[PDB]
Coordinates of C-alpha atoms and ligand atoms in Angstrom, one line a residue:
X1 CA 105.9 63.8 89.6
X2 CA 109.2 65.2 90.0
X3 CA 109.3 66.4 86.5
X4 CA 105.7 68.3 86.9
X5 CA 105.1 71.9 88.0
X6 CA 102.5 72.0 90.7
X7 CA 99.3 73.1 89.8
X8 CA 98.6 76.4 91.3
X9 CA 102.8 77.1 90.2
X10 CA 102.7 80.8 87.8
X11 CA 105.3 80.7 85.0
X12 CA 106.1 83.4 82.8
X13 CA 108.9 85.5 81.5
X14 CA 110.0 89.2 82.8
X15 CA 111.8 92.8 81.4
X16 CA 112.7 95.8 83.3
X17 CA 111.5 99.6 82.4
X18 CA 115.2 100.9 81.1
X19 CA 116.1 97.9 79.4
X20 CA 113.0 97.7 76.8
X21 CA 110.7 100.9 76.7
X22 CA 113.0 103.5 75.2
X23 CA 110.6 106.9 74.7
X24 CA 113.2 108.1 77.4
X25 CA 112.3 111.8 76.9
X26 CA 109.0 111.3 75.3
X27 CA 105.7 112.8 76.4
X28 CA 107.1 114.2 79.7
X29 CA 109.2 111.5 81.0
X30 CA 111.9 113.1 82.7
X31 CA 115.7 112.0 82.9
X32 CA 116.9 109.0 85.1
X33 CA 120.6 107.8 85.8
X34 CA 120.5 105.2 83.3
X35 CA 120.2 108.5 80.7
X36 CA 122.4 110.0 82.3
X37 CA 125.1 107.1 82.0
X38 CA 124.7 106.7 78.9
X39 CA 124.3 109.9 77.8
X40 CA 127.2 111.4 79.3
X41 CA 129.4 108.4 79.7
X42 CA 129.2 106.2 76.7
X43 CA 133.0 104.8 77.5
X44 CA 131.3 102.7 80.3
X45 CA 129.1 101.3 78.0
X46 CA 129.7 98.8 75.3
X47 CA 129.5 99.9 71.8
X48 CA 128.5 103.9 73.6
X49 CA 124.5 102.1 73.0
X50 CA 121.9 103.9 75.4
X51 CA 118.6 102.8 76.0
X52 CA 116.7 105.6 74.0
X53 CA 114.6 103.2 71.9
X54 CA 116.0 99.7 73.3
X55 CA 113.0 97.5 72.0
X56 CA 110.9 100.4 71.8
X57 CA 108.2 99.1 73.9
X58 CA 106.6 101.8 75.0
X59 CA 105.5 101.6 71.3
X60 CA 105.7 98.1 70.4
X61 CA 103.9 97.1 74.3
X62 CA 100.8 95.2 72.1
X63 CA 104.0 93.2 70.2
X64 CA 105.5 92.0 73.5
X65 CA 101.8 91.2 74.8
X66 CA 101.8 89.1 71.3
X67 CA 104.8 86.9 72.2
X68 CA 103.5 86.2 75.7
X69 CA 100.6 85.1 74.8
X70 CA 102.5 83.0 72.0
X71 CA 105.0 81.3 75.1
X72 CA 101.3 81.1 76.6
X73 CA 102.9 83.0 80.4
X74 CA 100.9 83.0 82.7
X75 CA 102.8 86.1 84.4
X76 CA 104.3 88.8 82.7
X77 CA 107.0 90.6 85.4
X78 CA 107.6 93.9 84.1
X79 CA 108.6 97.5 85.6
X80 CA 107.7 101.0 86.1
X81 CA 110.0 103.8 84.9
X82 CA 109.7 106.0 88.1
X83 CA 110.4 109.3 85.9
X84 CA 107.8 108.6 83.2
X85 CA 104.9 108.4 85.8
X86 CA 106.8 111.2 88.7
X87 CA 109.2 113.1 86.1
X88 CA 110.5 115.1 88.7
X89 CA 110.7 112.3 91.1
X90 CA 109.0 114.0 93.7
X91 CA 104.8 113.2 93.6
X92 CA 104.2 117.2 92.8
X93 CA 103.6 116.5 89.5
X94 CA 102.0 112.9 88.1
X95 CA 102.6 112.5 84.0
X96 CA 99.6 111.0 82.5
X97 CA 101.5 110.1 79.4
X98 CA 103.1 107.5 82.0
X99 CA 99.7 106.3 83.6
X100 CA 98.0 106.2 80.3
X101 CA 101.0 104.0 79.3
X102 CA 100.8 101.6 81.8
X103 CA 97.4 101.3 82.0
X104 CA 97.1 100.3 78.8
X105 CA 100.1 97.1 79.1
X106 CA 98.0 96.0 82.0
X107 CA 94.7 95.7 80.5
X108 CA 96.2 94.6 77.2
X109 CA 97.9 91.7 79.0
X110 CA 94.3 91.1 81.4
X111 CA 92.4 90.7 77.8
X112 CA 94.9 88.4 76.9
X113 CA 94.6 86.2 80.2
X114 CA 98.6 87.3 81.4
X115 CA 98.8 88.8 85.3
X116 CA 101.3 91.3 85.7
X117 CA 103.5 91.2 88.3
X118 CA 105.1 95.0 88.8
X119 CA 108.5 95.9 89.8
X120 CA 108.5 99.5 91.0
X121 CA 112.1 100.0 91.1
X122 CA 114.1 98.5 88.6
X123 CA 117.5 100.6 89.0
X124 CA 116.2 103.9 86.8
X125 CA 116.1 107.0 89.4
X126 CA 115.0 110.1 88.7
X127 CA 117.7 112.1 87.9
X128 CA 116.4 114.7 90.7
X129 CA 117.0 112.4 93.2
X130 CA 120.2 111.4 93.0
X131 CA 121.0 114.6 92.5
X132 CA 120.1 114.8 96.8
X133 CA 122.3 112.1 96.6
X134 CA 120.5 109.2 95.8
X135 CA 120.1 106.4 97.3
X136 CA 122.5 107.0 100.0
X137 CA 120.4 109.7 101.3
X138 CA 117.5 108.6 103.5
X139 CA 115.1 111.1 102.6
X140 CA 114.3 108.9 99.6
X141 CA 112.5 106.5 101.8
X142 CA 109.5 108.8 101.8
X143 CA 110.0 109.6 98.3
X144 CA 109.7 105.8 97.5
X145 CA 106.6 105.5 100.0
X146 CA 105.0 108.3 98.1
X147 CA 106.1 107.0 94.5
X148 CA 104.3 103.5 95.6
X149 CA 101.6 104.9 96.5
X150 CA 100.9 106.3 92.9
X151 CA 101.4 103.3 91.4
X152 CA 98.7 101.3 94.2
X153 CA 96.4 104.2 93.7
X154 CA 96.2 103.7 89.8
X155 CA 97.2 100.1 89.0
X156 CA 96.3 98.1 92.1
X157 CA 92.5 97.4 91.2
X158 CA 94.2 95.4 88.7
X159 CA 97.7 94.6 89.6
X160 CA 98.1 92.0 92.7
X161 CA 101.9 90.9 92.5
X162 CA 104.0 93.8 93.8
X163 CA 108.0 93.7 94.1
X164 CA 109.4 96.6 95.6
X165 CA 113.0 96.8 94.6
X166 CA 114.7 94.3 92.2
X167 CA 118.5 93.1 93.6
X168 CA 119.6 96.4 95.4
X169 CA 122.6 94.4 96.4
X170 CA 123.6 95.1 92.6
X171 CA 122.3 99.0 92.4
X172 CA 123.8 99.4 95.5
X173 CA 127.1 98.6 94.0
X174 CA 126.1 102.4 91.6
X175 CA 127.8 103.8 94.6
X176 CA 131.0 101.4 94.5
X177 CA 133.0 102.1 91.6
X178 CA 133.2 105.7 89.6
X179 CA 132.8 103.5 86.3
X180 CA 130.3 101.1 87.4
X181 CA 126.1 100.7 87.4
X182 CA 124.6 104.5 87.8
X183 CA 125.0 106.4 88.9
X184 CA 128.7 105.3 88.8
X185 CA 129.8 106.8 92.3
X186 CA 133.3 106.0 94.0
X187 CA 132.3 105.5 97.6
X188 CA 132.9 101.7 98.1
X189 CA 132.3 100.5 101.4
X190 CA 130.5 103.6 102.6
X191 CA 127.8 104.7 100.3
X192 CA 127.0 101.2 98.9
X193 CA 125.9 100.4 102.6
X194 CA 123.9 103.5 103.1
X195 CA 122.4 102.8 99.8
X196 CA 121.3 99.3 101.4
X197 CA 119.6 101.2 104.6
X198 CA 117.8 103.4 102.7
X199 CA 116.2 101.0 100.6
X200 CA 115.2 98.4 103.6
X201 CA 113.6 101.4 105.0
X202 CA 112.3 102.2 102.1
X203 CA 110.7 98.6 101.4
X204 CA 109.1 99.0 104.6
X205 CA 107.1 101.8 104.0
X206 CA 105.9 100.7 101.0
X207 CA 104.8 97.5 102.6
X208 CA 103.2 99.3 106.0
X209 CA 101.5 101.6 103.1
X210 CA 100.1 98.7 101.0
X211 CA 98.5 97.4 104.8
X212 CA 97.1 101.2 105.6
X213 CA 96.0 102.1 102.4
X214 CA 95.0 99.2 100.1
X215 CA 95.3 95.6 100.7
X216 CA 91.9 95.7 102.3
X217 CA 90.4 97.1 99.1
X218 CA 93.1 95.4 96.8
X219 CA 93.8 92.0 98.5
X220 CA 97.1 91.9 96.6
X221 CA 100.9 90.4 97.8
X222 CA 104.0 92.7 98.0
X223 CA 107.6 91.0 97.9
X224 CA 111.0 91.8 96.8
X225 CA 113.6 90.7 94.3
X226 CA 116.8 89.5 95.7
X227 CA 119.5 88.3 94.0
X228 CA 122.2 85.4 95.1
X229 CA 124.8 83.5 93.7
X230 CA 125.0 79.7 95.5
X231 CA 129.0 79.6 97.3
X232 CA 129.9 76.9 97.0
X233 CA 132.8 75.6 99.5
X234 CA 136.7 75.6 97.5
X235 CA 137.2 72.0 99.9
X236 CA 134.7 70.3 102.3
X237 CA 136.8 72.1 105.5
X238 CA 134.8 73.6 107.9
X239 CA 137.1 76.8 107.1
X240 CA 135.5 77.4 104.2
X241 CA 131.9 76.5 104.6
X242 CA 132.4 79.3 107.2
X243 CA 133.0 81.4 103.9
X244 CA 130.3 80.5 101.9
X245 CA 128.0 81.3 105.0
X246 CA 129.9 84.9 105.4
X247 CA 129.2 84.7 101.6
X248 CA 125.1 83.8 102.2
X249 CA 125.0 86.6 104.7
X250 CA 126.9 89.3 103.2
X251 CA 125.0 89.0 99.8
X252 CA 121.0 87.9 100.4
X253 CA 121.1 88.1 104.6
X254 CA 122.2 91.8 103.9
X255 CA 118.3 92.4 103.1
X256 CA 116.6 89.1 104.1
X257 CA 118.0 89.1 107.7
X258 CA 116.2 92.7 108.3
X259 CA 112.8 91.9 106.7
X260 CA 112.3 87.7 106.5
X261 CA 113.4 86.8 110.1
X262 CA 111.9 86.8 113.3
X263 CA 114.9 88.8 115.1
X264 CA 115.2 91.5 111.8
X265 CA 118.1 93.8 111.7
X266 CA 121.2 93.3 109.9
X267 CA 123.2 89.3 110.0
X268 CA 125.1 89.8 113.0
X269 CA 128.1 88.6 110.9
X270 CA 127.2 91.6 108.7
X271 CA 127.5 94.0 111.5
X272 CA 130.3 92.4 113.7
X273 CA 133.0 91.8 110.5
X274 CA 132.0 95.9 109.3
X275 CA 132.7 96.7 113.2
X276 CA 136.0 95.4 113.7
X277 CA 137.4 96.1 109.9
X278 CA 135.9 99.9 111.2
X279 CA 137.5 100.1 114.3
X280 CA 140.8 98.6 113.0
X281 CA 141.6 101.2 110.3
X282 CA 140.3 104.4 113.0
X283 CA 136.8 105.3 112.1
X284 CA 135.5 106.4 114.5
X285 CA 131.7 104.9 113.8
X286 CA 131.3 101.6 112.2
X287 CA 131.0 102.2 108.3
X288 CA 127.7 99.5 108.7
X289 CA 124.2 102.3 109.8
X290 CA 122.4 100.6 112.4
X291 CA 118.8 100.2 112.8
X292 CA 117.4 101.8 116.2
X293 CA 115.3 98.5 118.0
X294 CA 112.2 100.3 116.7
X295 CA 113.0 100.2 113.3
X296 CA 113.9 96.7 113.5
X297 CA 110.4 95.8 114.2
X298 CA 108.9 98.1 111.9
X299 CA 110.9 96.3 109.1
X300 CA 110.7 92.8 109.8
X301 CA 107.3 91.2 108.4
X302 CA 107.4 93.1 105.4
X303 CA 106.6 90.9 103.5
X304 CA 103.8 88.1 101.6
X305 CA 106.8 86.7 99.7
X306 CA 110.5 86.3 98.3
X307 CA 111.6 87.5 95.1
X308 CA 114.7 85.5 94.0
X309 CA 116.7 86.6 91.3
X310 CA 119.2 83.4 90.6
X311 CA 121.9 82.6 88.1
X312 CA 125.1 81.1 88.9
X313 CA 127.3 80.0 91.2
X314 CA 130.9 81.0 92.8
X315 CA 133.6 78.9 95.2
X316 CA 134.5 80.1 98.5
X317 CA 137.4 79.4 100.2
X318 CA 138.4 81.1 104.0
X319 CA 140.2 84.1 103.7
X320 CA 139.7 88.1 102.8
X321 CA 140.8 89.8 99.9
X322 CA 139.4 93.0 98.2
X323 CA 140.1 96.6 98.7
X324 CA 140.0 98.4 101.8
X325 CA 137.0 99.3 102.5
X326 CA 134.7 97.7 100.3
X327 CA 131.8 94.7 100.8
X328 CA 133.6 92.3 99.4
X329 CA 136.9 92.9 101.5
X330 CA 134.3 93.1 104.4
X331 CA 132.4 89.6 103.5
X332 CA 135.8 87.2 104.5
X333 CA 135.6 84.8 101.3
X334 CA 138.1 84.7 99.0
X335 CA 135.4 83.8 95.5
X336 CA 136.5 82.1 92.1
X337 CA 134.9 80.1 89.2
X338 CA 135.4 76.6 88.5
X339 CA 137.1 76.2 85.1
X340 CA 135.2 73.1 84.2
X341 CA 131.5 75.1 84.6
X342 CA 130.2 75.8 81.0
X343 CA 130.2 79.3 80.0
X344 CA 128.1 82.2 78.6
X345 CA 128.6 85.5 76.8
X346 CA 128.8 86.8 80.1
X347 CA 132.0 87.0 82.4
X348 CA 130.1 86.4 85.9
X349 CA 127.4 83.8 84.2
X350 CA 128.8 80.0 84.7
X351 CA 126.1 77.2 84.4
X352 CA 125.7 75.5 87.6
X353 CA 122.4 74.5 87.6
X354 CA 122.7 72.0 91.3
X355 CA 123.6 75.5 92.8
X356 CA 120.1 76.6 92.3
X357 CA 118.9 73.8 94.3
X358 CA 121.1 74.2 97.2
X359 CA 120.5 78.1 96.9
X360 CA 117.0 77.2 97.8
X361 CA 117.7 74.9 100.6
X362 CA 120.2 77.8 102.2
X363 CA 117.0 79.9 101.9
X364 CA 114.1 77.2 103.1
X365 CA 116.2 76.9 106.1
X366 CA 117.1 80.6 106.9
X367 CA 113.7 82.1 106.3
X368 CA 111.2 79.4 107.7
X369 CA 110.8 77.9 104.0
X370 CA 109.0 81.7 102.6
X371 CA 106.7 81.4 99.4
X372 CA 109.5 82.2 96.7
X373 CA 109.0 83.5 93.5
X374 CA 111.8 82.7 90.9
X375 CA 111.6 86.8 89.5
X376 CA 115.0 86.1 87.1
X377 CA 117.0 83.3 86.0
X378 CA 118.5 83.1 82.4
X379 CA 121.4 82.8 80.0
X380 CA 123.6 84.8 77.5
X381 CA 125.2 84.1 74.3
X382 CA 126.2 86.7 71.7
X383 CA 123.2 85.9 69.4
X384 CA 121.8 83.3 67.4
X385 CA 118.0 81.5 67.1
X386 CA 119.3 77.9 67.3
X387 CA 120.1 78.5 71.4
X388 CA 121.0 74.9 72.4
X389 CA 123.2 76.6 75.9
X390 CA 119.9 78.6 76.6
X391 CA 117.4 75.7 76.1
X392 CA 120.3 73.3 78.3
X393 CA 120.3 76.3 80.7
X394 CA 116.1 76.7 81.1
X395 CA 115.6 73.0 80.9
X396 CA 118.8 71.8 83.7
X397 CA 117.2 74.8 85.9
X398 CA 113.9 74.2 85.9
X399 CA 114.7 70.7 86.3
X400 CA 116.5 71.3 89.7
X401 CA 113.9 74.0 90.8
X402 CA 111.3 71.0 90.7
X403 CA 113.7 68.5 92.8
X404 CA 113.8 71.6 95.2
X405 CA 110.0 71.5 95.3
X406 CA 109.0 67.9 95.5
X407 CA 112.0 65.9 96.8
X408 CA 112.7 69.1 99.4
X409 CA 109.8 70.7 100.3
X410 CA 111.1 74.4 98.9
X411 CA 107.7 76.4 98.9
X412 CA 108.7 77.9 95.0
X413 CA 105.2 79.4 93.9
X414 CA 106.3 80.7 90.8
X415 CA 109.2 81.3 88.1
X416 CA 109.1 84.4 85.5
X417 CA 112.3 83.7 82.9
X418 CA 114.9 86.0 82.1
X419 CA 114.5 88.0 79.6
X420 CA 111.0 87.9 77.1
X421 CA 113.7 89.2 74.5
X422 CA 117.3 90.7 73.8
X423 CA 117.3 94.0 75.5
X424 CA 119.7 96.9 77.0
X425 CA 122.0 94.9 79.0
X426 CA 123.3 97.5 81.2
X427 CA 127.1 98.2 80.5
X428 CA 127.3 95.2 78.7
X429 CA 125.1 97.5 75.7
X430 CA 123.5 95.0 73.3
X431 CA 126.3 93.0 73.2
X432 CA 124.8 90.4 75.5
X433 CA 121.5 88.3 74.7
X434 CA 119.1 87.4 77.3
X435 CA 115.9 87.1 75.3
X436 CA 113.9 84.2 74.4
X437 CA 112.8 86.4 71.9
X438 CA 115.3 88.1 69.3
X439 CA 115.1 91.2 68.8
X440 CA 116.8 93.4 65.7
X441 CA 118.3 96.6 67.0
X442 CA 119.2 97.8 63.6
X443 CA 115.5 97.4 62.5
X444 CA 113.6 100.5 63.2
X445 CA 110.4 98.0 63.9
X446 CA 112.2 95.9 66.2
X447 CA 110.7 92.7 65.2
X448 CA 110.8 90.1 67.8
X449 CA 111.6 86.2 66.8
X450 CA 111.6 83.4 68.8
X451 CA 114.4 81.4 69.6
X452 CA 114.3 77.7 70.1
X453 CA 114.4 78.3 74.0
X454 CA 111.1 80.0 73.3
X455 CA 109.5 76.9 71.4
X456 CA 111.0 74.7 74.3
X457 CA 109.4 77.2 77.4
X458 CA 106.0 77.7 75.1
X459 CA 106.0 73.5 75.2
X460 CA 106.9 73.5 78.8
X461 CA 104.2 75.8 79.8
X462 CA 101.9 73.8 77.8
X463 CA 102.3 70.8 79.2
X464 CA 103.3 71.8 82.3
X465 CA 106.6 69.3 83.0
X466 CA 109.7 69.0 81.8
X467 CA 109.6 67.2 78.1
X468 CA 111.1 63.5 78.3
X469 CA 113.8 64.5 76.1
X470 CA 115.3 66.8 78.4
X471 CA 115.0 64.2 81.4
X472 CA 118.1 62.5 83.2
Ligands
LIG1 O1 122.3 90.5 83.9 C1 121.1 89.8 83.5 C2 119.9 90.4 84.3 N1 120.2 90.1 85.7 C3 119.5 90.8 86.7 C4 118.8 92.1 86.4 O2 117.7 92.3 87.3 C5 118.5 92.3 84.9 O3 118.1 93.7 84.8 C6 119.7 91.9 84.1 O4 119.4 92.2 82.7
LIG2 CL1 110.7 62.9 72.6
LIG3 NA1 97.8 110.0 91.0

């Protein structure tokens, strides 16, 4: 039993818009940070690569249908490239190039018996906006609102899986670091935050929008994507458990607290720690916005589900370190890596695969045990078919998800793997592989092969538990 996914449980695999479409000035698209990154500043970028043709799939969309229906996924998670469908950001002008495009990946994957699941915003802004500012700038709350409502208008007859925003507690970081995520902006501890408000707010008109306009008709679910690392405590003190619970709070609570509780607004860790740190180096005002009491209780509710984006783990230990001001000074836990976790190709990835059970136990107890949909998890190498660390990775994971589900109760409905195949991995270029799927970036065609983690999820899906071989 243990070792068996429920019945009803949707398991597929997922991409992001940037990462995979390329076409990034085709047929009216217009420009997004992620172009302009990488475009403009190739030195933050491995190898200089952009995502101008990635896999190509705004081409090669029937090919990635091809290998779902190969893995046999039920749910294919996928995103929308805001500027190809709104190239000017604003919803004055609606590129049906972009609709056309989209339209067509959902009804291809329908034939083929795949539900999509749609992330609006997967970290590619239209260049327009940020030039208001971006994210920081609460005016793009509407603009979100009135991008959503584009995408329910055309796509929700047949789309019923909405996530909003995928981990805004990583684009929000864009506004953290001048070499960083796009759009690479220097204003840690300030404009990160602001980022954060904008976005819950912006959530939350996109959920009171789907109730208005469209879930009568539509009868669709709209969640999130958050992402957390499980913190682990250095020693069993009390001291640091109170770290890995500033950690919890400062990193998922951040945007759980405000729409998955009962009270709403901000952690009140979240807003105390930001007060004092505020106060003691002379702002004036508290570098944490504040929610007014009515928009607490226009934001909390928003929500038919949890999006959970998980990968690895960190230690805490009580203390503060960081720069002034920044989140991470602000959070109060001083985080390392345990030398003895197995690696990836990727500096922040360790293999912790018990983390994922407790992560969902933290959450189970926080939230009132949510429906949560596993949106993300995954491994990196450097490349390679015969993927023993990823197939180790998938099957420990998985593994632990199902003792989360049966021996604890953890309402998991669902888990989409990270990635379908080797795409743009953000600054890391294509140095890093995600994919289940290969994928040759020096072949024009971009042929995609699978790896032995996808013969081992295909025969997972298939028989729907975990294969004796890979059992304790
Ligand atoms: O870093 C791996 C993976 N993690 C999370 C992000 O949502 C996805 O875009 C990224 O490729
Ligand atoms: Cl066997
Ligand atoms: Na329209």
């Amino acid at each position: 039993t243990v070792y068996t996914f429920p019945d009803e449980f949707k398991l597929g695999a997922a991409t992001a818009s940037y990462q995979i479409e390329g076409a990034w000035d085709e047929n009216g698209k217009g420009p997004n940070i992620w172009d302009t990154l990488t475009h403009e500043h190739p030195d933050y970028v491995v190898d200089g690569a952009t995502g101008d043709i990635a896999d190509d799939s705004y081409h090669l969309y029937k090919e990635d249908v091809k290998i779902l229906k190969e893995l046999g996924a039920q749910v294919y998670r996928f995103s929308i490239s805001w500027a190809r469908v709104l190239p000017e950001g604003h919803d004055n002008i609606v590129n049906q190039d972009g609709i056309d495009y989209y339209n067509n990946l959902i009804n291809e994957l329908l034939a083929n018996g795949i539900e999509p699941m749609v992330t609006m915003y997967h970290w590619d802004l239209p260049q327009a906006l940020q030039d208001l500012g971006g994210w920081p700038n609460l005016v793009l709350a509407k603009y979100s609102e009135n991008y959503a409502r584009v995408l329910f208008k055309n796509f929700g007859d047949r789309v019923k899986l909405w996530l909003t925003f995928n981990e805004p507690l990583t684009f929000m970081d864009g506004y953290a670091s001048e070499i960083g995520m796009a759009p690479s902006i220097n204003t840690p501890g300030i404009g990160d935050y602001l980022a954060a408000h904008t976005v819950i707010h912006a959530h939350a008109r996109i959920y009171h929008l789907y109730d208005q306009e469209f879930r009568a008709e539509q009868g669709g679910k709209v969640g999130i994507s958050l992402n957390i690392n499980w913190c682990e405590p250095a020693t069993n003190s009390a001291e640091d458990r109170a770290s890995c619970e500033n950690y919890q709070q400062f990193n998922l609570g951040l945007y759980a607290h405000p729409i998955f509780t009962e009270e709403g607004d901000y952690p009140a860790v979240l807003k105390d720690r930001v007060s004092r740190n505020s106060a003691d180096e002379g702002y004036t005002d508290s570098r944490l916005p504040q929610f007014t009491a009515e928009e607490v209780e226009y934001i909390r509710g928003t929500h038919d589900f949890l999006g959970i984006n998980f990968y690895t783990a960190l230690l805490g230990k009580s203390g503060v370190e960081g720069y002034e001001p920044s989140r991470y000074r602000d959070s109060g836990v001083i985080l390392t890596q345990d030398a003895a976790w197995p690696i990836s190709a990727s500096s922040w990835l360790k293999v912790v695969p018990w983390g994922f059970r407790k992560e969902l136990n933290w959450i189970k107890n926080e939230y009132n045990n949510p429906p949560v949909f596993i949106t993300e998890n995954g491994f990196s190498d450097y490349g390679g078919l015969n993927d023993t660390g990823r197939v180790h990775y998938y099957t420990e994971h998985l593994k632990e998800m199902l003792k989360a589900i049966h021996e604890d109760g953890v309402n998991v409905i669902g888990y989409t793997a990270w990635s379908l195949m080797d795409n743009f991995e953000w600054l890391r270029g294509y140095s890093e592989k995600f994919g289940i799927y290969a994928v040759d970036f020096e072949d024009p065609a971009r042929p995609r092969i699978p790896k032995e983690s996808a013969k081992v999820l295909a025969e997972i899906m298939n028989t729907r538990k975990i294969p004796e071989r890979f059992r304790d």
